[PDB]
Write a protein that binds this ligand. Structure first.
Ligand SMILES: *[C@@H]1O[C@H](CO)[C@@H](O[C@@H]2O[C@H](CO)[C@@H](O[C@@H]3O[C@H](CO)[C@@H](O)[C@H](O)[C@@H]3O)[C@H](O)[C@H]2NC(C)=O)[C@H](O)[C@H]1NC(C)=O
Ligand SMILES: CCc1c(C(=O)OC)ncc2[nH]c3cc(OC)c(OC)cc3c12
Ligand SMILES: CCc1c(C(=O)OC)ncc2[nH]c3cc(OC)c(OC)cc3c12
Lengths: 184, 102, 116, 105, 142
């Protein structure tokens, strides 16, 4: 603080061995990738002062988060897909299933919400939740369009239902793979 | 951020900025721990405050902040829009299927 | 106990008639939402540990039973049009099959953790 | 960098009438404005420092009114010996001065 | 181990106030159980209504148990409120099982289904009243 480079000077004693005990350290959800030791001088308005920096690198563990969050969202998508098999007659059943799936996804999103601080940017997990919501919402809109069209033509409704049944899992797989590859 | 002297009135102790008042409060380039805010700038003023014990000098500094709306857009606005759209979806449902609309 | 009783609840759908499709669907989804919220409540009291733990195992497996029951019911509804007789066959055999699985799994889990 | 505009560029009246001078800052200067009067063949003399504080050895006739950007100098009951220029300057940043105001009669 | 010392002791005698626990825990339990028996009075034909009554009541009781258990510190043994919640849970579960049995016996023996429905209607309120009376009289007077 009070002594400049004309008065004092710092250095790590036994450079490599100066800091010890990092290897034995464990964190509940982090892994110490490595650490570095710097030695520089910082210039303030009152002079130049010696400085030392001990910096770690911490990598998060995805198993916790995978299990806690990624599974339930994909599973709600699974239920939204199961909704298609149900015959067009049971409008109430399919509608209730889909809306309840939406609400469950919102519940898991909310449970995520309390943990992290407010931040302007969108995190990766937020991106995945948004994508899953787009999938579910498009499925429900597709069913609404099917119901509207059916009275004009029932065969069109059946064929379009089969078409969506076959493709939505494919598009979900594609988006999931591209997202994972982008963020890994 | 206002500061002055405790117990020394203007007749005894007076404060002043070291350099030009515009350059007397410096913010480090790498130091900003704001999450949902932006620091546009700062301004300094010097005045006088009256109190029972006497009349004192006050140095004033204002830090101008603007809130970031990115978090709230995803958090509330989009969910509200989507809920409104889902509520609309009810119109296109067939009149027969009362339970679905309920 | 709450997880065991939720798994117990998921059964009752089977006895109910296949015709009441909305009832079975609503019950299944409500039970799934319950299992999710209960899993969430359970975890918080624990520190965030990467490695799986015993309490994670029980919650996960009970959740799997619930999901399996609902999925099998949906597949049953689809297959009824294809083969109603096979549908009733599967309802009865599910009724008699799953309970043995759940109980033997419970016993294996408990005895294994007692042994260690 | 900061522009100070003085208005009016010139104005006059008879002895005793209230006279007001106005100086406006392009940007924010928080009461760091000053007023000087420069008699003919003389150096400037400080009249008002800070927004309103009256410099020692100055008659109570002069008074200054402050703001963030809009400042004024009022000479209540102008006498017949106040016939000099009047410069507004800001010190919030590197000092700048206004074009000055000429007072006659 | 370092000698004999004089120890001065004082005891402050406290008694808990129950009103908050009444309003937050017991009253909702009573209401949910009452709803569970209200389920019986519906027509057997309206299967979905009875199904949703049963499921929602069981779920409300589960959530009230997890909510009530968090107030007091974690402890191995069981509290009186825990027994009350457990018994109300048992009543809700038995009501749902009764509905399932009635459904099964429907379309095979309408008379037997109606008889068991009436019998359960008369029995459940009676049993709940007996249990509630005994529990309250037991704990209040001591
Ligand atoms: C964590 O962040 C810090 C800060 O950004 C990283 O420290 C940086 O480390 C590099 C490599 O040691 C430094 O580069 C060096 O710069 C000097 C300047 O003369 C040069 O002579 C060397 O050849 C080398 O290139 C860099 O200056 C330093 N950053 C600062 C601000 O000092 C650190 O590497 C990051 N990671 C970890 C695991 O700590
Ligand atoms: C509209 C669905 C929804 C609901 C609900 O059930 O309203 C019907 N509730 C909470 C929600 N939080 C969300 C966050 C999202 O991503 C930024 C999102 O995707 C755009 C959707 C929701 C969302
Ligand atoms: C309708 C009863 C109920 C239920 C339920 O689902 O029962 C059908 N669930 C949660 C509840 N919290 C309550 C808090 C109260 O007091 C402020 C209260 O006062 C009468 C009732 C409840 C209550």
């Amino acid at each position: 603080y009070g002594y400049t480079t004309d008065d004092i000077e710092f250095y790590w004693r036994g450079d490599d061995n100066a800091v010890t005990g990092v290897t034995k350290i464990e964190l509940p959800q982090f892994s110490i990738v490595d650490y570095k030791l710097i030695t520089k001088k910082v210039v303030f308005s009152t002079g130049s002062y010696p400085r030392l920096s001990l910096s770690f690198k911490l990598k998060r563990n995805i198993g916790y988060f995978i299990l806690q969050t990624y599974m339930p969202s994909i599973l709600i998508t699974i239920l939204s897909w199961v909704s298609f098999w149900i015959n067009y007659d049971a409008s109430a059943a399919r509608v209730a299933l889909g809306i309840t799936t939406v609400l469950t996804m919102t519940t898991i999103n909310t449970h995520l919400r309390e943990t992290l601080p407010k931040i302007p940017y969108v995190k990766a997990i937020d991106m995945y939740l948004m994508g899953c919501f787009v999938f579910v919402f498009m499925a429900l809109l597709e069913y609404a369009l099917v119901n509207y069209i059916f009275f004009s033509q029932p065969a069109r409704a059946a064929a379009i239902d089969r078409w969506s049944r076959i493709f939505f899992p494919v598009v979900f797989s594609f988006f999931n793979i591209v997202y994972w590859l982008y963020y890994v | 951020l206002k500061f002055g002297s405790y117990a020394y009135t203007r007749a005894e102790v007076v404060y002043e900025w070291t350099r030009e008042p515009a350059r007397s409060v410096v913010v480090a380039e790498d130091g900003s721990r704001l999450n949902q805010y932006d620091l546009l700038g700062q301004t300094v003023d010097s005045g006088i405050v009256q109190s029972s014990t006497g009349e004192y000098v006050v140095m004033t500094t204002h830090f101008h902040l603007k809130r970031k709306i990115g978090y709230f857009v995803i958090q509330t606005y989009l969910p509200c829009i989507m809920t409104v759209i889902l509520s609309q979806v009810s119109f296109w449902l067939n009149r027969e299927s009362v339970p679905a609309r309920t | 106990i709450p997880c065991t009783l939720i798994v117990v609840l998921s059964w009752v759908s089977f006895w109910i008639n296949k015709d009441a499709v909305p009832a079975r669907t609503s019950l299944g989804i409500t039970t799934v939402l319950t299992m999710t919220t209960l899993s969430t409540i359970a975890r918080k009291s624990l520190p965030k540990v990467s490695y799986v733990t015993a309490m994670d195992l029980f919650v996960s497996v009970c959740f799997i039973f619930v999901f399996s029951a609902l999925v099998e019911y949906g597949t049953l509804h689809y297959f009824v049009s294809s083969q109603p007789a096979r549908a009733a066959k599967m309802d009865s055999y599910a009724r008699i099959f799953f309970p043995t699985a759940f109980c033997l799994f419970n016993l294996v889990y408990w005895v294994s953790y007692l042994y260690l | 960098n900061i522009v100070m505009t003085q208005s009016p560029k010139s104005m006059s009246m008879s002895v005793g009438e209230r006279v007001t001078l106005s100086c406006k800052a392009s940007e924010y200067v928080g009461t760091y404005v000053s007023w000087y009067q420069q008699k003919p063949e003389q150096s400037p003399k400080l009249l008002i420092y800070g927004a309103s504080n009256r410099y020692t050895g100055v008659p109570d006739r002069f008074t200054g009114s402050g703001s963030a950007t809009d400042f004024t100098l009022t000479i209540g009951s102008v006498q017949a010996e106040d016939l000099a220029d009047y410069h507004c300057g800001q010190s919030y940043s590197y000092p700048t001065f206004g074009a000055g105001t000429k007072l006659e009669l | 181990s370092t000698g004999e010392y004089v120890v001065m002791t004082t005891h402050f005698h406290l008694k808990r106030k129950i009103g908050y626990f009444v309003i937050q825990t017991y009253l909702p339990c009573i209401m949910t159980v009452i709803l569970s028996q209200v389920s019986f009075w519906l027509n057997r034909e309206s299967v979905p209504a009875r199904t949703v009554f049963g499921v929602t009541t069981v779920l409300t009781m589960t959530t009230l148990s997890i909510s009530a258990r968090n107030s007091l510190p974690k402890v191995a043994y069981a509290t009186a409120m825990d027994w009350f919640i457990a018994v109300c849970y048992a009543f809700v579960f038995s009501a749902l099982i009764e509905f399932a049995t009635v459904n099964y016996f429907t379309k095979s023996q309408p008379a037997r289904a109606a008889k068991i429905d009436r019998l359960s209607r008369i029995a459940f309120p009676l049993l709940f009243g007996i249990f509630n009376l005994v529990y309250w009289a037991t704990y209040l007077n001591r």
